[PDB]
Structure formats: structure tokens, C-alpha cells
Amino acid sequence: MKLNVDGLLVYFPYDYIYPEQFSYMRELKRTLDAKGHGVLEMPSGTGKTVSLLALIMAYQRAYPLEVTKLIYCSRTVPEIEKVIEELRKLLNFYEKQEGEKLPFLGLALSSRKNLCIHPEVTPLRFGKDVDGKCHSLTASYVRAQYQHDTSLPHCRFYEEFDAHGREVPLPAGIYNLDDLKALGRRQGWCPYFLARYSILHANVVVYSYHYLLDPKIADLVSKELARKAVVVFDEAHNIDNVCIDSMSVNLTRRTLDRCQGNLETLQKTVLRIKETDEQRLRDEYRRLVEGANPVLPDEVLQEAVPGSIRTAEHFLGFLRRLLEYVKWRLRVQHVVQESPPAFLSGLAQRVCIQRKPLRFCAERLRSLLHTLEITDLADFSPLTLLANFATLVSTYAKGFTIIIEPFDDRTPTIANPILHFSCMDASLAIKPVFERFQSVIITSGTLSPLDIYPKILDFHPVTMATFTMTLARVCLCPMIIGRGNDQVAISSKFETREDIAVIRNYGNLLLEMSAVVPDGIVAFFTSYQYMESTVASWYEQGILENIQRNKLLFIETQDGAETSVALEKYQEACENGRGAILLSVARGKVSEGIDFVHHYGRAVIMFGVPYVYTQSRILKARLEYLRDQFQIRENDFLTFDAMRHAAQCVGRAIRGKTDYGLMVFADKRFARGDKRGKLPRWIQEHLTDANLNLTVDEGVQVAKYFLRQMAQPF
Amino acid sequence: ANKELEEKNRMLQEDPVLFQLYKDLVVSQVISAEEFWANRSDIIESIFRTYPAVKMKYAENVPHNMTEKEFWTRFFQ
Amino acid sequence: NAAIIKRFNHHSAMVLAAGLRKIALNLKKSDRYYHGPTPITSQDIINSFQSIRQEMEAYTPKLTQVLSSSAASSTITALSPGGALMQGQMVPNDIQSELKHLYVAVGELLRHFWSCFPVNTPFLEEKVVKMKSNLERFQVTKLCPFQEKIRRQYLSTNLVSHIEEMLQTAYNKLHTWQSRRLMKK
Amino acid sequence: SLIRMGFPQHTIASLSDQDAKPSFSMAEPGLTLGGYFCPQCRAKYCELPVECKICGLTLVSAPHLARSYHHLFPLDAFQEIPLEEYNGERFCY
Ligand code: SF4
Ligand SMILES: [Zn+2]
Incomplete structure (x- = not known):
């Protein structure tokens, strides 16, 4: 599939792609053409990923003298593992389209915790333990002791890599972390050090944001050799918070x-x-x-x-x-x-x-x-x-x-x-990335208005475009519920947040929604105290019993293991006829780590605008500095971060494969003129007055209709 | 349980002609009949069946000289 | 307070753990379908075609020349209950319950006797059920005529031999199957 | 796969309860003046098609099979001509 992109004809594997992909590619191309950084937003992950890779690869093939390498960064290793497989798929297509192999190499980097094969550290699972042992195994004294050939537990993979793995660089291909470990095992070379070395002879490198934000790891990977290379963030909507x-x-x-x-x-x-x-x-x-x-x-x-x-x-x-x-x-x-x-x-x-x-x-x-x-x-x-x-x-x-x-x-x-x-501030900390690399592209989903970012980060955006999904059917349905069936406002005001009626309205809404929404449903709370208080209130009432009776319910906590098991049980419950409900805090680690898919978070409920406790000293220092130094108003940024975090947790319902999802916001605040403008364009344009101020009952009725309309094929 | 025997009592009331033949076939000795068979509260119980603690506790602390509602109270109290 | 969440999630966890036990159409001769079970001079066509064309010279005749009371009455009398075209009992009552008793008995007995009767099954347990079924047929044949004698002596009219025919036919199948099995052996 | 099947014929009393064969239906069964049989069951039946209550063999009448032959003879779709296309047949055939 040859795509008539603005700069050149771009080869693409799929016979059919949606109109917005062409726009996104030709828009992103402007950053390359203008030799400068920019920002843009696109809901779909896979689509924007494959189109990005196709565009940058075609551009690199067209202008290898202009762009030497592509640096791509994504939220987490499990996502990176899929992206690097999509690149391999694209390369497999490109090789088939070209009919011959080309001198091209791409690889994903990761910490020694995962990217390791040594038997002595293999039973270790904590990252610092694996790193500490690896460092010791690679230490000059152990190397010297190894060179003394005395009885010593040493990293044979390192010695063989330093001797042979360093002597011969890998010629071409795409190597995933699991494939890189197998390669390292077969070759008897350290995957981590081999990958690190392969960066010197590779065209594409993939690692998460902390591999670029923390200078110790970032410097080793962001050397001056990349003086004319492009770095792209695919889901760094919180780049500021992660950087800080x-x-x-x-x-x-x-x-x-x-x-x-x-x-x-x-x-x-x-x-x-x-x-x-x-x-x-x-x-x-x-x-x-x-x-x-x-x-x-x-x-x-x-x-x-x-x-x-x-x-x-x-x-x-x-x-x-x-x-x-x-x-x-x-x-x-x-x-x-x-x-x-x-x-x-x-x-x-x-x-x-x-x-x-x-x-x-x-x-x-x-x-x-x-x-x-x-x-x-x-x-x-x-x-x-x-x-x-x-x-x-x-x-x-x-x-x-x-x-x-x-x-x-x-x-x-x-x-x-x-x-x-x-x-x-993120600007001064991230400054070397924009100063050294010729172009930086800030791509993300659930991205709140772009013009705030040039304030928090020092950049001169070449592009300022917000894309919205283009499909034959409205696969996504955002809706805002502002009133309870008890003819009362459902707003999460700080004083009203604790109101038993609002708590009851959320319980009735969740009871009805959990009964009508198939498979897995998820609801996000503002904090564990309110969540527990809400759950306890629902337990004193029949609400919690009716909910559990209608469908199994799970609740997330600060414990990663407990939440992991509960989430696996929630998913397994969704596989079987039982189905499950997942209650979680928006700011919880599970919300930033979990990915929602068909029948796994089919509908996402947001209870109130997620505002952090404004008396926290961290917020105080951060917010006053943004006003004092960057001149952003306290309520402006505080609402922006709440809008961003809400969209982030709620917008994850759409990820790819063209699977439908529902996004219901239980707060009339989201329906306010300013909050609507701070909401991302794709949500904002799908949102409409008919679903902007729905009553709890109206939400259930429109959801049931939408589910009926989505069940048939396109 | 004596289900093999109980089935006769079960069918004694479910169908009279069926049972009347089952008897007459032996009363008049039409065929060897033993071959016949070769061819042919919820609160506590749901909790007991669902939870291991109650499953084990009820087996050891089974109600004796008491009311089952007391055992229910001992659990939810 | 957290125990409520822990217990509710333990409950859902235990409920889940308890719920986890340890070709295109083809044809070669389709014309045969057109007939189903249905089974299977040239001048006469021309003569009939010409003769009928001349027969069609007269139309719209007089109803009283078309039909007559003699012809009409002949039809009505033929269709009368005594005519050529008009074609046109729970006397014993205690026997009704006896027939049900017998029908239920014979029905129950014959299902077992036929359970493996039509299949060849040259196997030990499958052949023994044949023999066991035959022995049971010899057993029912002892008691069934005794009930028949009661019916025959009590009724001595409106005999009911249908029930007996199922038994007699099972024996015809018995003798044919037995002789065939011995012949095949 | 092939299947063994029985095609019995409905039989009735000769004339108004004469030369009849008193019997009850196999389906409080009433008396049967006429009905189908089975070559093996020799039990009279009032309604067909049905599986043998004894032999476990299907009894059916030939028209019941033909009722399915439209599946074997799918009708070819007629070409559409929504316009008059100067078709002189004003009346639909
Ligand atoms: S040297 Fe290589 S194989 Fe050995 S511990 Fe470090 S990363 Fe693992
Ligand atoms: Zn039969």
C-alpha cells in the first residue's frame, strides 16, 4: 500500500487505513521539513505508531543524510515490546515490498532486571539486586580476578561479549527483548551490554522516558553522535511530572x-x-x-x-x-x-x-x-x-x-x-534533549491543551494539531452525567464530595451501569479515603450487596502484588461468565500501568474531577513556582492537571484493534465551558449536549442503546 | 445414601402404573426384575459452600442444642 | 474498615477460585430428485388437436340442455349415505385399564429387548445382551398369554390381538436373527 | 453419513368400524381407528414423522423429505430491471 504523503510516496503494509492517519503523517512530516520540534495528539496507539514508523522510515530512507537515527520512547516495557514487534512487522513488509534485505537495525533497550541472562542473578527479581550483582560481576576487580583465572563466579557472557561480541557488531534486523535475550544466550553475550553496544551501530533505539530523562542512562544513550537524529515521545502526556x-x-x-x-x-x-x-x-x-x-x-x-x-x-x-x-x-x-x-x-x-x-x-x-x-x-x-x-x-x-x-x-x-x-520545572531539566537533538515530537493521547506545554517545557512547537478518530461508526462514546436521579447535582465539590446523596447516586449509577455494561467495567475514585468511605457507605446500604450480587467486584490498593492478583482475577472473571468490577483510585499506580481493551475495561467510570489535596506542600511548591516563574494561574494548572489525569485514566479505554468503549464522567464540572475546552478534542467533539448533562438514568439508557448499536459488525 | 432403594419410593408417587408394573413384573414373575436398575437454610449453606473458614468451622462447630440463626449471628456479628 | 474491602475482595476471589475446578454443494445425478418415489399413436395427438378444435365450435349452451334432473339426482343419490359414493368402540371398560397395563408393560419390555437387537455387534458383552434379551422374551411369552387368556375368556368378543402381534413379530425377528447369526458364524 | 429410515403407510378400518384392529396410540392415549405402523415395533401411531419408541429409528412420509429439497435446489436470483426498459408486458406474468 503506497501512500501519497506530502513529501513522498510511503509504502504501507495494510491495504486500508483511515483518513486521519494521512493527516497525522503529513502533519508530523512538517517537523522533519521544518527541522524543528512540535507537539500533536492522536487517540489510537497502533495507528499513530505504525504511521509514525512508516513516515520516519520513508523519510529516513529518503533523507538518511539528514536524519541518522530515530529515537522512540514509550510509557513502559510491555508497550515497547509490542511497538518493536510492530516495527519488525513493518520491516518484514518493507523487506517484502523491496524484495531484498537492507542495512537496517532497530532494537529495544531495558534495564538489567529484565534484560539479563546470567544464572547467578536470574533467581533475583528486584531490580537493584540484579543491578548490584551485575555491576559486581562486571566490576574491574571481578574482571581482574577473572583474568587471574582463579576460581571465580564470573559473567562468561560479559567476557565473551567484550572479547567477541564487541569485535563483531550485529549486521541488521529487529531484536525484541525476549529475542535479544535468546540471541544473547545463543551467542553467549550479555544482552544488556550487547544492546548498549549495538546502539553505536543501530538506526532505531527504543526505551522508556526515564532512559532519556535520567542523565546517567540518558547520557550514555544520547551521545553527541546523535547530534542530527530525531527523538519522539509517543505517550509522554505526563513528561513534566516524570521529569520533575x-x-x-x-x-x-x-x-x-x-x-x-x-x-x-x-x-x-x-x-x-x-x-x-x-x-x-x-x-x-x-x-x-x-x-x-x-x-x-x-x-x-x-x-x-x-x-x-x-x-x-x-x-x-x-x-x-x-x-x-x-x-x-x-x-x-x-x-x-x-x-x-x-x-x-x-x-x-x-x-x-x-x-x-x-x-x-x-x-x-x-x-x-x-x-x-x-x-x-x-x-x-x-x-x-x-x-x-x-x-x-x-x-x-x-x-x-x-x-x-x-x-x-x-x-x-x-x-x-x-x-x-x-x-x-521540566524545561531546564529536559533542556538538553531539545538543545542537542534537531527535532523533538511530543505525541500522546488524552493530551489536555497543547499551549500549556510550551510554558512548562521550553520549546517552540512547529506543529499544534489535535487529531480525532475517523471511523465508519462512533466506536467511542464519551458522556457526562451531571445530575443524579434524585434531582440533585452530582458535582464532586470538596464540601459536597462527602454528601451521602452524591455517594448514593454514584452507587446507584454504578449498580445500574455494572448491570447493563457487559464483561469488565472500571470506576476511578479521587482517593482511597473517599473510596473506602464510599465503599463502607455502600456496604452499610444495600448498594454494595446489589452490586456484588449483580457482578463480582474488585478494589485496588497501594499493594502491587494484591492489585496484580485482583486485576488478574478481575480479568479472569471477565473471561468467564461471572464478569467483574474494578474500583481504583485515579492516581493509583494501577491506573497508569493498566491498559484497557475490549471486555477488559469496556466502560470506564470517573467519579468527580480528580483534584489532589491542595494543602499538600508538594502541590503548594509546584503551583506557586509555576505562577511565580511561568505565570500559570493556580486554578488553571490545577484544573489542567486534573483534566489531564482524568482523561489519561478514562481515555485508556481506546487503545487499538477498533474495539468499542464507553467513557462516563459523573460530574457536571466536566460539562462546564472551560472544562470542556480543556478536554481533548477527540473527546470534546464526540461529546455533545445530548450526553453533556445526562441524568444517571439517561446515562444508563444511552449506554444500553450504544451497546446495542456497537454489537453489530461495521 | 440409599438412593437405589429410595428411587422406588420416589417413583411410588410419581407414576402409579409405572410402579404397579414394576411390582406386577415381580408379583407375576414376568421377567427377572433386578436387571431393571442396571438400565435405569440457603444463607448458611451458601456461605458454608463458598467460604473455607465457615466450611471448616461448621464441620467442627456443627449446631447442637442450639438454633442455626445463632450460628449465622456468630458469623456476621 | 479495610477488612470490609479485603473480605469483599476475598469473597470475589474465593467465588472465582471455587468456580475453577482443579463445503460447496455437489451433484452428479440431480434429475433423479425430480421424480422422488414416483414410478414411470402419434397421429392421435393431431387427430385430438383437430377434433377438439372442431368441438370448440359451440359454446355458451343452454343450462337445461347441459344438465338434467335425472343426471343430477343420480349424483345426489350416489352421494347419499346409502349411495355408491358415500362411504359413511369402547364396549369393554375394565379391559381399558388392563390394555394400558399391558401396553406400558410391553412398551417398557420391548425398549430393552430392542436396545441392541438390530445392531450386529459380534462382541461378548453385546452378544450376551442379545441372549439375555431373548431369555427375557421367553420369560414375557410365558406371562403374556396368561393375560391374553383372561382377556379372551372375559371378552370372548372384540378380540385385541395387536398386543400379541408385537410379541409374535419379535419372535419372527428372534428366529430370523438367531438363524442369520448362526448362518453368518 | 447415511441413516436407516422407515417409511410406513397409514392404515384404517375397512368401513365404519369394520375389520378394525382396536388399539391405543403410542403418543391417557385414546383408541386408534386408523394410524401408521412400524415393521419392527408393530405399534400403531397417530402422528408422523416420529422416532421409533422401540427401535430408535425414524419413521417419516415421503413428502416430508421433499419439503427440504428446496435447500438442495436453491433458486437462482432473478435479474433486477427496476426501470420499465420498454418491456411491453404491462401485466406482471
Ligand atoms: S554481565 Fe550481562 S549476563 Fe552478566 S549479569 Fe550483567 S547483564 Fe546479566
Ligand atoms: Zn420401530
Whole structure:
């Protein structure tokens, strides 16, 4: 299927594709043509993916001198695994269309937790454990011990890869993580290191956003060689929050206690070294005096001489001084305060620790830790985090704040004080991506208005287009319920949120909807407290019994294992005749991780506008900074994030394969003129006055009709 | 249970001519008849059948000198 | 409070765990379908065609020349109950219940006797049910004439031999099958 | 697969309860003046087609089979001519 795209005729595998795909491709092409970044939105995942790959591949085949490589990033590995299979399918078509093989290579990267084959780490399942052992297995001392040929458990796959795998680069093809592991097993080469090396001889690379946002991993993959390469985000609607979160760090009482235990372990190691030999380790002292990896970005990090910290004793003393000050500053009993400059100024005043040596805390730590021949970093991790935090806060804080909380999060009060170095802007943190790469494309679904993004992120969008699904039938049906059958407003106002009538209206609505919606249905709540309160209220009433009697019900919690089992049971219940109902919190990890498909979340219910507790210090610092620095109003951004998060959790009902789904919003707020404008265009245009202010009964009636209309073939 | 025997009582009231022949075939000895057979509350019970704890608890703590509604109360209280 | 959610989800989990136990149309000779069971001078056609054309010279004749009371009465009398064209009992009552008793008995007995009678089945257990069925046929043949004698002596009129014919025919099938089996053996 | 099938003939009393054969129907069964039989069951039946209550063989009349032959002789669709197409036959045939 040759597509008459604006720039060139593009070969495509499927004989038929929808009109919006042509627009999306020819629109995205503008970013290539204009040699600049842009933003756009498209509901379908697979369609926009395959069309993106086709467009960029054809463009790359047409202009290989202009674009050397394509960098694609997506939400998670399970999605990446499907995308890379779609690329293979596209390449298989292209090879069949061309009739011959071409020098093209594409691969997906992943952490050593998944992308590993060594027998000793294979029984390990925690990422830090696998990484710590892998690092130890690949460590220079283990390599040296291996070169000594003494009895040693070593990574034969690494030695054979360094010897042979490095000597011969893989010629061409597409290698999925499972296929890359099998390849590594067959070749006897480390899949992770082989993939990392293959980046040097590959045209397409796939990894998640944190492989691009965290500078340690991102720098190794975003080298200057990619000075004229294109990077594309496919579902980074929360790129700001992920970026800020990747920059933010949390310190706690137990963290400091672990750091102290680690510090005592370092001291014991220094003693063991001093009693054995320190002169050999002083070989590092020369390069240090001459002048895991730090999270500091390319332009922020420098190989400057570490300063007064010139010995292990100095570093350990300097670390002791800081740890004591941090513990002291953390254990202080007072209201939550923000000291962005004052913490550093306080550190200089209270313990006379200057930012200059402190800037090299992580640099010296890794150097010292390496020379110390430590077993593994897994246990030292809290101390490394403290050292990373220390260098980070001492280097720059323009886009950060220090928050001190007498108690742990998620709890009203606990005798475990915590400190946060909360980040507040994505622009400066993501700046290297836009500065180095020639084009950046922000693609996503459930994407709230685009013009807010150029404010939160520093970019000059070449494209500003919002696409809507084009089909012979309205496969998606958004609807907003604003009134309960009890002739009462169903709005989730903060004071009205706890109203028994609204709670009852949601229960009656869910009872009826769960009875009429086939297979799997899902409902999102604002928070566990309201959810439990709501469930408890429904349990005191007959509502919860009638619901469970009509269909099985499952509820999500903070526990990943319990929610995973419950979700698997929910899905298995949907496979069988029993069917199931899934209740979850919109902000819950399950909502950002789960993908909804036909009969698996066929209908998604949103109870109220998802507004986070506005008294939370994190929100306060973030929101005031956006107003002070980026000039965005408090209610503007707070509503934008609520609209975005609602659409994100609710819009996931449509993912691909042209399967129908229902999206009901139980709040008249969504029907307001501003909220409607903040709603994504595809939802906004399918939404209409007939379904904009439906009564609970009207919602059930329109849903039942829509289900009847969707059951027949196209 | 003596279902083999009970089936006679079950069919004694379900169909009289069927049972009358079953008897006359033996009373008048028309054929060897033993060959015949070779050819031819919900609250507690639903909970007991559904939950392992009640399943085991009811087996050991089966109602004796008490009212079943008391056992129901002991569960939901 | 969380126990309610935990219990409700345990319940749904236990309910689920309890619900998990450990060719185009083808033809070669279609004309034969047109007939079904239906089974199977040239000048006379021309003569009949010409003669009928001259017979069609007279039309719309007089009803009183077309028909007559003699012809009409002959038809009505023929259609009368005593005529050539007009073609035109629960006397015993206690026998009614006896017949039902016998019909139910014979019906029950014959289902078993025929259960494996028409199939050849040259196997030990399948052949033994044949023999066991025949022995049972020899057993019913003892008691059935005794009931017949009662009917015959009590009625001595309006005999009911139909019931007996099912038995006699089963014996004809018995002797034919037995002789055929011995012949095939 | 092929199937063994029985094609009995309905039989009646000769004339107004004369040379009759008193019997009840196999389907409180009433007396049968006339009815079908089975070569093996020799039991009289009032309604056909039916499976043998004894032999387990289907008894049926020949027209019942022909009632299905339209499935074997699917009718060819007639070509549409919605316009008059100068067809001189004003009357539908
Ligand atoms: S060197 Fe390769 S095989 Fe060995 S632990 Fe690391 S990733 Fe796994
Ligand atoms: Zn028969």
C-alpha cells in the first residue's frame, strides 16, 4: 500500500487505513521539513505508531543524510515490546515490498532486571539486586580476578561479549527483548551490554522516558553522535511530572539510619584497607588531585577537582558532618518549611560545609567506592542517594526547593520525619534533549491543551494539531452525567464530595451501569479515603450487596502484588461468565500501568474531577513556582492537571484493534465551558449536549442503546 | 445414601402404573426384575459452600442444642 | 474498615477460585430428485388437436340442455349415505385399564429387548445382551398369554390381538436373527 | 453419513368400524381407528414423522423429505430491471 504523503510516496503494509492517519503523517512530516520540534495528539496507539514508523522510515530512507537515527520512547516495557514487534512487522513488509534485505537495525533497550541472562542473578527479581550483582560481576576487580583465572563466579557472557561480541557488531534486523535475550544466550553475550553496544551501530533505539530523562542512562544513550537524529515521545502526556519526579529526591529518618550503618561499613572497609594496603588506592588520589552515575546533566556536571576532600578520611569526615547536619535539620520539630537557599546557607553556617567540595560528593563517592572494591551498591544505595542529593542541592537549586516534613507521607503524623528536594520545572531539566537533538515530537493521547506545554517545557512547537478518530461508526462514546436521579447535582465539590446523596447516586449509577455494561467495567475514585468511605457507605446500604450480587467486584490498593492478583482475577472473571468490577483510585499506580481493551475495561467510570489535596506542600511548591516563574494561574494548572489525569485514566479505554468503549464522567464540572475546552478534542467533539448533562438514568439508557448499536459488525 | 432403594419410593408417587408394573413384573414373575436398575437454610449453606473458614468451622462447630440463626449471628456479628 | 474491602475482595476471589475446578454443494445425478418415489399413436395427438378444435365450435349452451334432473339426482343419490359414493368402540371398560397395563408393560419390555437387537455387534458383552434379551422374551411369552387368556375368556368378543402381534413379530425377528447369526458364524 | 429410515403407510378400518384392529396410540392415549405402523415395533401411531419408541429409528412420509429439497435446489436470483426498459408486458406474468 503506497501512500501519497506530502513529501513522498510511503509504502504501507495494510491495504486500508483511515483518513486521519494521512493527516497525522503529513502533519508530523512538517517537523522533519521544518527541522524543528512540535507537539500533536492522536487517540489510537497502533495507528499513530505504525504511521509514525512508516513516515520516519520513508523519510529516513529518503533523507538518511539528514536524519541518522530515530529515537522512540514509550510509557513502559510491555508497550515497547509490542511497538518493536510492530516495527519488525513493518520491516518484514518493507523487506517484502523491496524484495531484498537492507542495512537496517532497530532494537529495544531495558534495564538489567529484565534484560539479563546470567544464572547467578536470574533467581533475583528486584531490580537493584540484579543491578548490584551485575555491576559486581562486571566490576574491574571481578574482571581482574577473572583474568587471574582463579576460581571465580564470573559473567562468561560479559567476557565473551567484550572479547567477541564487541569485535563483531550485529549486521541488521529487529531484536525484541525476549529475542535479544535468546540471541544473547545463543551467542553467549550479555544482552544488556550487547544492546548498549549495538546502539553505536543501530538506526532505531527504543526505551522508556526515564532512559532519556535520567542523565546517567540518558547520557550514555544520547551521545553527541546523535547530534542530527530525531527523538519522539509517543505517550509522554505526563513528561513534566516524570521529569520533575526523576529530578526530585526524598530523604527520611530510616534512610539516614541506613546511611549511618553504611557509613560504619565504609569505616570498617577503610580500616580493612589501611590494615592491608592504602598506597595502591592512592593511585586514584593522583587523578583526583589532577582532576550508578550522578543524576547531574551534561552541562551541569564537570570534572573539576574535588576540593578539600582529598582523602578518604576527609570525605568520610565531610560526609559525617553533612549526615549529622542533615539528621539534625531533618529531626527538627517544626512546621513544614521550604529552604531552597537557606538549607545550603544553613549548611555553610551551621556546619561550615561549603558547596564547592559538596559539589563533588557523588564524584568522590563513586571514585572512593570503586577504589574501595565494595561488594555491591545495593546496600550502599541510601548513602549514594544522600551523596547525590548533597552534590545536587549544592550545585543548583533554581528549579528546586528543600521541604522538611516531621512525618512520612501518606500518613497524618508519624515519628519518622522526612525531607524532600522537590523539583518544580521540566524545561531546564529536559533542556538538553531539545538543545542537542534537531527535532523533538511530543505525541500522546488524552493530551489536555497543547499551549500549556510550551510554558512548562521550553520549546517552540512547529506543529499544534489535535487529531480525532475517523471511523465508519462512533466506536467511542464519551458522556457526562451531571445530575443524579434524585434531582440533585452530582458535582464532586470538596464540601459536597462527602454528601451521602452524591455517594448514593454514584452507587446507584454504578449498580445500574455494572448491570447493563457487559464483561469488565472500571470506576476511578479521587482517593482511597473517599473510596473506602464510599465503599463502607455502600456496604452499610444495600448498594454494595446489589452490586456484588449483580457482578463480582474488585478494589485496588497501594499493594502491587494484591492489585496484580485482583486485576488478574478481575480479568479472569471477565473471561468467564461471572464478569467483574474494578474500583481504583485515579492516581493509583494501577491506573497508569493498566491498559484497557475490549471486555477488559469496556466502560470506564470517573467519579468527580480528580483534584489532589491542595494543602499538600508538594502541590503548594509546584503551583506557586509555576505562577511565580511561568505565570500559570493556580486554578488553571490545577484544573489542567486534573483534566489531564482524568482523561489519561478514562481515555485508556481506546487503545487499538477498533474495539468499542464507553467513557462516563459523573460530574457536571466536566460539562462546564472551560472544562470542556480543556478536554481533548477527540473527546470534546464526540461529546455533545445530548450526553453533556445526562441524568444517571439517561446515562444508563444511552449506554444500553450504544451497546446495542456497537454489537453489530461495521 | 440409599438412593437405589429410595428411587422406588420416589417413583411410588410419581407414576402409579409405572410402579404397579414394576411390582406386577415381580408379583407375576414376568421377567427377572433386578436387571431393571442396571438400565435405569440457603444463607448458611451458601456461605458454608463458598467460604473455607465457615466450611471448616461448621464441620467442627456443627449446631447442637442450639438454633442455626445463632450460628449465622456468630458469623456476621 | 479495610477488612470490609479485603473480605469483599476475598469473597470475589474465593467465588472465582471455587468456580475453577482443579463445503460447496455437489451433484452428479440431480434429475433423479425430480421424480422422488414416483414410478414411470402419434397421429392421435393431431387427430385430438383437430377434433377438439372442431368441438370448440359451440359454446355458451343452454343450462337445461347441459344438465338434467335425472343426471343430477343420480349424483345426489350416489352421494347419499346409502349411495355408491358415500362411504359413511369402547364396549369393554375394565379391559381399558388392563390394555394400558399391558401396553406400558410391553412398551417398557420391548425398549430393552430392542436396545441392541438390530445392531450386529459380534462382541461378548453385546452378544450376551442379545441372549439375555431373548431369555427375557421367553420369560414375557410365558406371562403374556396368561393375560391374553383372561382377556379372551372375559371378552370372548372384540378380540385385541395387536398386543400379541408385537410379541409374535419379535419372535419372527428372534428366529430370523438367531438363524442369520448362526448362518453368518 | 447415511441413516436407516422407515417409511410406513397409514392404515384404517375397512368401513365404519369394520375389520378394525382396536388399539391405543403410542403418543391417557385414546383408541386408534386408523394410524401408521412400524415393521419392527408393530405399534400403531397417530402422528408422523416420529422416532421409533422401540427401535430408535425414524419413521417419516415421503413428502416430508421433499419439503427440504428446496435447500438442495436453491433458486437462482432473478435479474433486477427496476426501470420499465420498454418491456411491453404491462401485466406482471
Ligand atoms: S554481565 Fe550481562 S549476563 Fe552478566 S549479569 Fe550483567 S547483564 Fe546479566
Ligand atoms: Zn420401530
